[PDB]
From a paper:
The crystal structure of Dhaf4260 from [name] [name]-2 was determined by single-wavelength anomalous diffraction (SAD) to a resolution of 2.01 Å using the semi-automated high-throughput pipeline of the Joint Center for Structural Genomics (JCSG) as part of the NIGMS Protein Structure Initiative (PSI). This protein structure is the first representative of the [name] ([name]) Pfam family and reveals a novel combination of two well known domains (an enolase N-terminal-like fold followed by a Rossmann-like domain). Structural and bioinformatic analyses reveal partial similarities to Rossmann-like methyltransferases, with residues from the enolase-like fold combining to form a unique active site that is likely to be involved in the condensation or hydrolysis of molecules implicated in the synthesis of flavins, pterins or other siderophores. The genome context of Dhaf4260 and homologs additionally supports a role in heavy-metal chelation. The Dhaf4260 protein family [name] ([name]) contains around 165 homologs that are mostly found in cyanobacteria, actinobacteria, thermotogae and proteobacteria, but are also found in firmicutes and a range of archaea; all of these proteins are approximately 230 residues in length.
The final model includes two Dhaf4260 protomers [491 residues; molecule A contains residues 1–102 and 110–251 in addition to three residues from the N-terminal expression and purification tag (residues −2A to 0A), and molecule B contains residues 1–102 and 115–251 and five residues from the N-terminal expression and purification tag (residues −4B to 0B)], six ethylene glycol molecules, four imidazole molecules, two chloride ions and 239 water molecules in the asymmetric unit. The electron density was insufficient to model the loop connecting the N- and C-terminal domains (residues 103–109 in molecule A and residues 103–114 in molecule B) and the remainder of the N-terminal expression and purification tags (residues −18 to −3 in molecule A and −18 to −5 in molecule B). Dhaf4260 is a two-domain α+β protein. Size-exclusion chromatography of Dhaf4260 in combination with static light scattering indicates a mixture of oligomerization states, with a tetramer being the predominant quaternary form. However, crystal-packing analysis of the Dhaf4260 structure only supports a monomer or dimer and did not identify any higher order oligomeric state in this crystal form. The presence of the 19-residue N-terminal expression and purification tag might also alter the oligomerization state relative to the wild-type protein. In addition, the Dhaf4260 pocket is both narrower and longer than in Rossmann-like methyltransferases such as MT0146, suggesting that it catalyzes the modification of a longer substrate or the condensation of two molecules. A chloride ion is present in this cleft in both molecules in the asymmetric unit and is coordinated by the backbone amide of Trp149 and solvent.
Residue numbers in the entry: -2 to 102, 110 to 251
């Protein structure tokens, strides 16, 4: 169990050296990296404080070196590390080579409404409207760092997730390093899904305690950067397409 960096090492060690950090922006809600034609994203908080000097240095470095930042206990740095990971795996050509299907022109909660009916479901993270989609059809528990009124604080994971038939976890858990314990707590679910724009589309994760990955393919590189930089007052989803791979 306490080979806990293993899932991080698996992601990093899959990146070929040839890939460089060609572009990097650290916005209020996401960090974003381009390596060639591929763009990856990682989530930030408005709490956490910027690091303009780290940002400058990573330009030019191997993507795999920058991905080492994912392990940082500084969460803005870790978000950059996840952006670098996702610049490799979520490159449209790389993703296609690893068996991800999508168009050059969906939602995991909607996809699994039938499957989770009458079952116990645990969700870690804040997902808009999720209560409306899932609460009427299943026994739903939502766990967050800073819970809204019907929701549980994160320490409740120890108590709740082992009882769950299905578990969904925000990709923010990669950044804050809660993911490995969450995976162990959920290991007897029928299925565990990692969800959000910062999810790596990395089938190696299916060997590391996950059965589904629900992320995001950027189709408009230039636009994705506009949004992350705050130059468009728009959600990141405008710049691409949701994509899901199952084990
Ligand atoms: Cl949260």
């Amino acid at each position: 169990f306490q080979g806990m960096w293993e899932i991080y090492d698996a992601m990093i060690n899959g990146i070929p050296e040839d890939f460089l950090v060609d572009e990097l922006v650290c916005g209020t809600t996401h960090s974003v990296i381009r390596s060639g034609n591929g763009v990856g994203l990682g989530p930030n908080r408005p709490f956490e404080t910027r690091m303009p000097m780290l940002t400058q240095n990573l330009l030019g470095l191997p993507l795999r070196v920058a991905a080492g930042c994912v392990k940082s206990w500084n969460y803005v740095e870790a978000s950059i590390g996840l952006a670098a990971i996702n610049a490799y795996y979520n490159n449209p050509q790389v993703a296609r080579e690893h068996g991800v299907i999508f168009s050059d022109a969906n939602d995991p909660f909607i996809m699994s409404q039938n499957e989770v009916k009458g079952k116990k479901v645990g969700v870690v993270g804040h997902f808009p409207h999720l209560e409306s989609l899932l609460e009427p059809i299943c026994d739903l528990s939502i766990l967050e760092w800073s819970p809204e009124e019907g929701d549980y604080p994160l320490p409740a994971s120890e108590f709740i997730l082992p009882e769950c038939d299905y578990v969904y976890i925000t990709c923010a858990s990669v950044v804050d390093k809660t993911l490995p314990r969450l995976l162990e707590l959920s290991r007897n679910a029928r299925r565990i899904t990692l969800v959000g724009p910062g999810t790596p589309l990395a089938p190696v994760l299916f060997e590391h305690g996950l059965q589904e990955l629900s992320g995001f393919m950027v189709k408009d590189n230039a636009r994705a950067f506009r949004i992350v930089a705050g130059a468009e007052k728009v959600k990141i989803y405008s710049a691409g397409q949701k994509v899901t791979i199952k084990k």
